[PDB]
């Protein structure tokens, strides 16, 4: 039942911008999300001080996916442990405690990819978090699907648009509610030629070119959030990427880089059936 939103797909209602994604299958400069628009959106909340740590996504009733650099990044003296964080699911407003809607869960264990490269280019920027107890689904809490080889092959194409969501900065400016922006995947050569950072097959970039007029990008605090696409085949939402890195936010000639979820699914599966 993953990837089918209670307030949209389940009722045969479409959100205001999913058509844009579909037409292409042939947060800075974003907008307020609709209620229940991204039921898999997870907020990584730091206990002390109480603040936004990163975004994340719900992939099952007990597992949450995020970016490794959200939990471990020595250059900025970041090395969070289970008890340092909380997971807030079903939220819309950034700072308000949404009584009777959101669910706050504690972490049981954190799993960071063994070959995550924080020293150089954030290669394999991915991590799993197992919750102490199952989260109850609702109109505002629902898991997104993980792509299989076929889904990745057909949707991960230059030009095809995905959707990024988060409570991160609005400019390189804190949002009142969850923000959303649809961005086109960019050809590998263009991604490579836009930066001096070494790009790997475990990442893909997205965003508009300067000549395309439109813009948008993820920013500080959006890391760990999902880059999703709605399959035109079975109408389910799939998380194809994880907000990973970028040089600044929404700069012309630059693009956002996302962890290639399918490429690391082997690891995800391994961890889930081994420890969970």
């Amino acid at each position: 039942d993953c990837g089918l939103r209670p307030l949209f797909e389940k009722k045969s209602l479409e959100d205001k911008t999913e058509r844009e994604l579909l037409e292409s299958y042939i947060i800075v400069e974003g907008s307020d999300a609709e209620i229940g628009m991204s039921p898999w959106q997870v907020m990584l909340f730091r206990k002390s001080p109480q603040e936004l740590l990163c975004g994340a996504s719900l992939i099952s009733d007990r597992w949450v996916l995020t970016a490794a650099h959200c939990l471990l990044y020595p250059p900025w003296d970041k090395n969070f442990t289970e008890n340092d964080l909380l997971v807030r699911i079903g939220k819309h407003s950034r700072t308000r405690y949404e009584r009777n809607i959101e669910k706050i869960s504690m972490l049981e264990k954190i799993y960071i990819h063994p070959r995550y490269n924080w020293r150089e280019n954030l290669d394999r920027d991915i991590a799993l978090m197992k919750l102490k107890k199952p989260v109850a689904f609702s109109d505002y809490i629902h898991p997104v699907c993980l792509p299989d080889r076929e889904t990745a092959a057909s949707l991960l194409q230059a030009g095809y648009k995905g959707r990024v969501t988060g409570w991160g900065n609005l400019k390189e400016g804190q949002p009142s509610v969850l923000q959303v922006v649809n961005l086109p995947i960019v050809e590998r050569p263009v991604c490579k030629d836009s930066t001096r950072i070494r790009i790997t097959d475990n990442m893909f970039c997205a965003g508009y070119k300067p000549d395309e007029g439109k813009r948008g990008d993820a920013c500080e605090g959006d890391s760990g959030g999902p880059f999703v696409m709605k399959s035109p085949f079975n109408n389910r939402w799939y998380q194809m990427g994880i907000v990973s890195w970028g040089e600044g936010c929404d700069r012309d000639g630059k693009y956002g880089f996302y962890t290639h979820v399918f490429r690391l699914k082997k690891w995800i599966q391994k961890v889930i059936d081994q420890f969970g």
């Binding site: 109480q50 700072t95 706050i104």
Partner: peptide, 11 residues
Amino acid sequence: DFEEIPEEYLA
């Protein structure tokens, strides 16, 4: 500027 969350989760 974050609203105080229940103590049950902080404990």
